[PDB]
Amino acid sequence: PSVFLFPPKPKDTLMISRTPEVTCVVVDVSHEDPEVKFNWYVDGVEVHNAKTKPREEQYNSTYRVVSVLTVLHQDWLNGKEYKCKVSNKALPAPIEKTISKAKGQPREPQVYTLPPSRDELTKNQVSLTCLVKGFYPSDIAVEWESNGQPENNYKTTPPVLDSDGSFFLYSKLTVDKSRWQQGNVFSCSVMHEALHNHYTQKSLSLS
Amino acid sequence: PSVFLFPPKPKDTLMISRTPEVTCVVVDVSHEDPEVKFNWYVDGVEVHNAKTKPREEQYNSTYRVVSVLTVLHQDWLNGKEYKCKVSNKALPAPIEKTISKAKGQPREPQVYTLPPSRDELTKNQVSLTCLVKGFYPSDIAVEWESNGQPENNYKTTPPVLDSDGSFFLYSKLTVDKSRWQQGNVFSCSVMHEALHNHYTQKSLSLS
Ligand SMILES: *[C@@H]1O[C@H](CO[C@H]2O[C@@H](C)[C@@H](O)[C@@H](O)[C@@H]2O)[C@@H](O[C@@H]2O[C@H](CO)[C@@H](O[C@@H]3O[C@H](CO[C@H]4O[C@H](CO)[C@@H](O)[C@H](O)[C@@H]4O[C@@H]4O[C@H](CO)[C@@H](O[C@@H]5O[C@H](CO)[C@H](O)[C@H](O)[C@H]5O)[C@H](O)[C@H]4NC(C)=O)[C@@H](O)[C@H](O[C@H]4O[C@H](CO)[C@@H](O)[C@H](O)[C@@H]4O)[C@@H]3O)[C@H](O)[C@H]2NC(C)=O)[C@H](O)[C@H]1NC(C)=O
Ligand SMILES: *[C@@H]1O[C@H](CO[C@H]2O[C@@H](C)[C@@H](O)[C@@H](O)[C@@H]2O)[C@@H](O[C@@H]2O[C@H](CO)[C@@H](O[C@@H]3O[C@H](CO[C@H]4O[C@H](CO)[C@@H](O)[C@H](O)[C@@H]4O[C@@H]4O[C@H](CO)[C@@H](O[C@@H]5O[C@H](CO)[C@H](O)[C@H](O)[C@H]5O)[C@H](O)[C@H]4NC(C)=O)[C@@H](O)[C@H](O[C@H]4O[C@H](CO)[C@@H](O)[C@H](O)[C@@H]4O)[C@@H]3O)[C@H](O)[C@H]2NC(C)=O)[C@H](O)[C@H]1NC(C)=O
Ligand SMILES: [Zn+2]
Ligand SMILES: [Zn+2]
Ligand SMILES: [Zn+2]
Ligand SMILES: [Zn+2]
């Protein structure tokens, strides 16, 4: 019997309209003695609002049981600790796992948009670059928009640890050169805990 | 046998030149079986640089033992967790205590200086007021200075929880009216984790 404790989806923690949840999964439950009890604690205080699902048999003759605890937007961002305790008559002691948001002093990202390189302006499609740097912790979301619609022809690098202990990344949006020359406004949209309302956007256009 | 785990002095965490330390104290050690072992962990990783003092007998026929772990300035501010584990042959299991810096999103104080009330200007001594508001967490240090020397005739209120979840306080420095009228410059000096370099000062003078 092993326990895995998963954090909420990062975007779910940065948008007050969403519902972040922590997920506790127990595997290798022997379906001879498959009795499983979950206890949940927030900063050591037991809470009772988790939603545990019925066990599901696995093809390897073991059971798997999942319990989901909803977490408050402010609680997660304020560093509360979530402990999942799993009890079972086959273990010499209960299994405990604790999780929290990534720790450390927060640092606000600086968001910079970079136009296509001059040499790239000869190609049929061009690269629009969004540099996000100086942020901590590394949890972040980046998307692109133009004229009130998503621009989804982009790829974003993972966060990279910079020499000052903050993170940076780059996002690359590829557009037809004609749309760049025509002067459309493209926006790099960034979500990170340390931005005001966890959100900022920076625009990019021919100039 | 009971264990108490104490945080560093708040000023010691805010000045890089100082040495913050966490202090683990075990009392009611029965000096029949007074064998005591400390284990220390930083975010669950065992560390070995604590300095444990020799036991001291108490007048109530018990022992008291103290162990001191130095903590790094950045580790404390970045929210690392310090666990002191105390083992003794008389307890059914070891005693664990964990401590960290006060949790929660940090908020930078706003520091405002307020001159004496007009009605107070008739008295022999006047009150110089420093309002510090909007800060989180509540750990803070406030002192007063003038012309490169400490002004120590002051009292500061405890932090008070404000309606937006931040803290405020006031500090009152009492000076001779003649020094206020003469135009001396008085400075409210504030240390808090969320200030740049954890330090700011605001001046007050007749104007
Ligand atoms: C018996 O079978 C058991 C059932 O598994 C079956 O496996 C399939 C491959 C089948 O083909 C078949 O073979 C089996 O029927 C099997 O259980 C497995 O046991 C593994 C350990 O032995 C365990 O491995 C761990 O996996 C962790 C990652 O798990 C995630 O990703 C994998 C895919 O990579 C996926 O299978 C899981 O379901 C997990 O997926 C994540 O789940 C969370 C929780 O729901 C999601 O988070 C939520 O997402 C929602 C939306 O989806 C919301 O956002 C919500 O708010 C969130 O909370 C998350 O999105 C989702 N991600 C993805 C990408 O799907 C590893 O982290 C873990 O690793 C540590 O691992 C070891 C230490 O143990 C070391 O390498 C490292 O130290 C590392 O730190 C570990 O690898 C499997 O997860 C588990 N499978 C399941 C389904 O639970 C069992 O082993 C079998 N027994 C025997 C004896 O064979
Ligand atoms: C047998 O005797 C034992 C020895 O005590 C003697 O008591 C004296 C009064 C004598 O007159 C005589 O009676 C005895 O010989 C006795 O041990 C005591 O046991 C108490 C519990 O039973 C325990 O109470 C706890 O006290 C905590 C506060 O302790 C601090 O403050 C008190 C004074 O208020 C002081 O006595 C302590 O020494 C502690 O002082 C703090 O110590 C820390 C660590 O050094 C300092 O932090 C460091 O400071 C340095 C610079 O100084 C640096 O800054 C460094 O970086 C820092 O880490 C700190 O500065 C210092 N502060 C001060 C102001 O001095 C309470 O927090 C605790 O409370 C919780 O308490 C209960 C739960 O248990 C509840 O009320 C609450 O839930 C609350 O949350 C608790 O009250 C005593 O501390 C302890 N005494 C000592 C000296 O260790 C034992 O009980 C006797 N046994 C019997 C059976 O009678
Ligand atoms: Zn319950
Ligand atoms: Zn913890
Ligand atoms: Zn928020
Ligand atoms: Zn050691």
Ligand SMILES: [Zn+2]
């Ligand atoms: Zn510092």
